[PDB]
Design a protein around this ligand. Sequence first.
Ligand SMILES: Nc1ncnc2c1ncn2[C@@H]1O[C@H](COP(=O)(O)OP(=O)(O)O)[C@@H](O)[C@H]1O
Ligand SMILES: [Mg+2]
Lengths: 49, 206, 589, 459
Amino acid sequence: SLQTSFVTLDEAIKITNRRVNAIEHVIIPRIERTLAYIITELDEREREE
Amino acid sequence: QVWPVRQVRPVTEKLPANHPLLTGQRVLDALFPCVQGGTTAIPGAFGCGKTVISQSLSKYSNSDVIIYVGCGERGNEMSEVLRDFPELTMEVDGKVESIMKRTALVANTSNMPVAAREASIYTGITLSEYFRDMGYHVSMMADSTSRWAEALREISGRLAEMPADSGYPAYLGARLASFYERAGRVKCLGNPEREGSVSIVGAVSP
Amino acid sequence: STFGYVHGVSGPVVTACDMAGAAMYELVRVGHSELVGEIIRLEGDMATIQVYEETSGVSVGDPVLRTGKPLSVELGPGIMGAIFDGIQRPLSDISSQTQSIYIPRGVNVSALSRDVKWDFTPCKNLRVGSHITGGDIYGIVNENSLIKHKIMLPPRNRGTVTYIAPPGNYDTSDVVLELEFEGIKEKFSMVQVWPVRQVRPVTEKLPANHPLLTGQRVLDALFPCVQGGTTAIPGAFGCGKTVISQSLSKYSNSDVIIYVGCGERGNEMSEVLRDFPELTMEVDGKVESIMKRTALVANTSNMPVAAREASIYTGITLSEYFRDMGYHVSMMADSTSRWAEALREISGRLAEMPADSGYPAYLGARLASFYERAGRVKCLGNPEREGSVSIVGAVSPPGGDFSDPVTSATLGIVQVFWGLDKKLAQRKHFPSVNWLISYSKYMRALDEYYDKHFTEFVPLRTKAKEILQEEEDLAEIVQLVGKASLAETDKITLEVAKLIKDDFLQQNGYTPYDRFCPFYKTVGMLSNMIAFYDMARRAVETTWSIIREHMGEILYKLSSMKFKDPVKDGEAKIKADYAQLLEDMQNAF
Amino acid sequence: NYLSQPRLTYKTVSGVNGPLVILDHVKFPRYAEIVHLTLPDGTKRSGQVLEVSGSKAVVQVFEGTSGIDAKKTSCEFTGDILRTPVSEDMLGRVFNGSGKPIDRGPVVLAEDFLDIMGQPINPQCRIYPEEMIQTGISAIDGMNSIARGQKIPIFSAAGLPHNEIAAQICRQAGLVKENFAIVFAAMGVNMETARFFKSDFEENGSMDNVCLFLNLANDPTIERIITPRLALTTAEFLAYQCEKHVLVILTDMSSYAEALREVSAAREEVPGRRGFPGYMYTDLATIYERAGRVEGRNGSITQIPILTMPNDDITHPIPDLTGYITEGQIYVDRQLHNRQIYPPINVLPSLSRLMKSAIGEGMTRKDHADVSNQLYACYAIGKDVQAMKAVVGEEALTSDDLLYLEFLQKFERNFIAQGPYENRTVYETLDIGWQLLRIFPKEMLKRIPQSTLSEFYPR
Ligand SMILES: Nc1ncnc2c1ncn2[C@@H]1O[C@H](COP(=O)(O)OP(=O)(O)O)[C@@H](O)[C@H]1O
Ligand SMILES: [Mg+2]
């Protein structure tokens, strides 16, 4: 009963550890360098005005 | 004959384009094909290969005559052209002749003055439309059309004109439209009833 | 002409007419109340003047009195212990003259009072008829017990002496020197007037070699600064900012300390103005105040914005004036982010084009032209002295991010960056100087002086930094894997790294014996912490468990080396010698 | 031939705002004319005429308008454009940013007076650079090899050792197996930056041919405009008119364009991106395209301009516009500098457009064009694999990609990391490069055909 709980937990804690790191490395830096592009492109409209 | 560069050459009637332009590249000929008499734009940052598409088209296309307009280009890139062109021969009638005999260059490098970038574009497309009327299939490579746009910005800044988006004048899109619309496969004026074409492949530098 | 008329005021700007012989960036006095302005455009006979004060009640026809000078400072005795604002109005003298709690905005009170008498002495072989050039030490005024205010010649003029003053007491208005030149003999008093935007001339620049002994252990060992160098620190709300500023004034090797509070706050400025006159200095004799060698530029946000722009240039000119006497000046500018907001206001006033995030095109040029005024440099003159100017400029970026048009322009110019951290102040890790992001470009210069004076030090720093970087890399895997799977050579690095972070890096500023540790103690505690680390390498590669339980008294000797009181100076080196050999005994066991 | 009429002196200023002085009642003013301002206290300031309209002439003084009077200042109109005194003895000395000697020296004796704006080279008589310069650095000589007559910048940032690799390629510049006259423009530099370059050129004994032009940060910003102009018209003199191979080092080119933005914003000209002027591409190309070699001359000029990109952005207007004019760049990175690699050169955004004609059988040897493309491809895949083991795990990758991990730790530590004074030859670089390709199998090297794999991969 502890054997079959142990073997299905780490194969379900690997898929959670990937979903955290896919947020931390692929999704969060992509939004943050998008948000940096919004700021400098809006500053470039203010100099044109 | 003396023809003004800002005036479109008269011609009998425009024709739809049917024969493709064979650039020699596989991704260019298969997925995104170009015709002779069509308009093409190559944007891209530095180091992407906007001149390797331009040099492989001026060496290996199906076009009768080739012109190459260096508009704000590098000085070494026009000296690169006139070295390997007199040694690259091609075969038309079983005879071998270099591709410099069908090539004509309009060189206005970035060191040269900025208002000549406007004049070098209109000079080329007049030479492109001149060999169109003989019945040849002309292909024109403008490199770069973004330097022509930077020339119009710097001239209109001196006249205190009011700017459109990002500095450029409000008549920027009318200058580009009046230059790409001089291309096309089209039946020429005259009695022997020949047909020519002008292809424009213009590099953009965003 | 001598006066101009107003001919129209449209805000801060006054377009004054009848101004034909006026120069650019010249200061005037507008109106009956004599509001100080600055000539900024000059259209023929008319000049437009931006006025530093509130133009309110200014008529069309009011006299614009031109001064013929640009924004300049008065340099002379009466400047130590004084408190000015950015355009150098004495705030301590202006409250006694008017007996009010405000600044009356029409007050042309002189920066150095002409009523106090100072004991002047000549240069003693500066005879009458002697040729003298600019920068020569002309006399000496005993301003305090500490500061000998050496009267000098201005670097503009030159001549031969015709009259010198006899040694006695004189004002700042008395004529002390007459010099004959080709046309006309010029006379002048002990005070010289020098513009703030113009760098003081000097004989030749020198590379900086002598380090600044700040007193803190993380600052003096890992990330050292030199006198004549440029330093930057983060200026956040509370990490260690007032602690590092007051330790630099109290326990440094520097002769005078100037502090430029530049557009700071309402109540953060009053914290400085009440705490600095009640600090204490440890001279060879009896304890004196820190205000005998201190001059403050106090400038709040309520004050004129063209005084907050000039507060940086006022301070560095006072820094260069006491540099020319031969002293070692250290300047603390707090902060340079509030100064850059004053540039954005002046450029936004004149409708200048915004270059980078609002800030004008010349933001990186004004910052370059300020940090380059600091340096160890041989002064002008024949007595051949040497001086220096150090600059510690605080940076207050938004949100603690180090990507900013002011921050990135600062870190590309400064060489030392003591990275003070907010989270290290949350754990009461004092001082809060982070060691991952901090750096110092002043190692090679220092490397010369440390082989003439300390010798066995450099390699000590290199391996101590190698421990702290390998500790952070190891600490990531402690939560992922565990300490039971870690190798034997690695786990001895972790305990001595914790030993460094508590004994070396942590330093309590209220525990008397730690207020100003001098140098050998700093080479002392690190020579025993890494020799213990080096001896543990071969002792492991010869069990980590048996050494950790049996060295608990020997580790207690290392963890108590910071309590060597200042009644133990030579004895502390003997205890440093004997505590090392107790480690040498237990290596074989 | 010679201007012999006496120059006029005007006390007729009518407006001064910012750096611009407006002179009235000038009789036939001239564009780009140089003038001399005499202040009411006696200090002399120079200035260029940037606009003339009828009788008015708008000049800009180089040292700023601080103190310029309206009634008492006197401007004297030198009847010609700004020409510098250039000579052969203009070599071996250190000068300031404007024109003047620094090391207690005389003014130059002026073999001729050359216009500092120059004039562009005819592209018909400009020969293409072919011979390769061996710089002794494997990241330069191996993967992004420069030619003699090539313009190629060093793309750097603040704090990175770009000055240290600038002095390294000056000591070790030689032909692939009669010295290079180095002209050095120091622009907006620190004092410790100028002392580093002075004490390096005075150390290797090359200071008999160094033309160092230094312009510190305390010096005015309008003099930074004419600083590469004077540093390139002496290099034009030494190479096209004195028959000598010249290496020009421009630093900092970011300090040039930030000084160029200040003058443009003061003239109220039209801005481009981030406040920089619209003619910034032209002004950068009038100092970049003055390089290369011509047909009738045996001398040449190569340019290595150092620029620091703001906030590590390669899409900033400084490295983008210099990337469109020059012939490939060198990218010294920051993430490789933290790992204590002395040239922290990320080779992926590095390029050399003239490297193809400079490699081959006659130039170095047969395998140079092929091992450089394979070292590029294995570094490109292994770095994308490096972004996969940081997000998934160090163990669950493809078995081929563990060799890509073993390649990258051997690439960044053995191939590019060489030390401040080690000067490898080009044959040493390809021999080290084949050692790193040895850890890959023969059939995974896709960019190399099977012919030259037989001669080099079994070893
Ligand atoms: N077909 C190709 N084969 C090999 N290398 C290429 C090819 N196309 C481009 N390159 C490389 O790309 C580099 C940049 O080419 P380039 O035309 O100058 O880009 P751009 O003009 O946009 O700056 C060239 O120097 C060359 O090394
Ligand atoms: Mg190109």
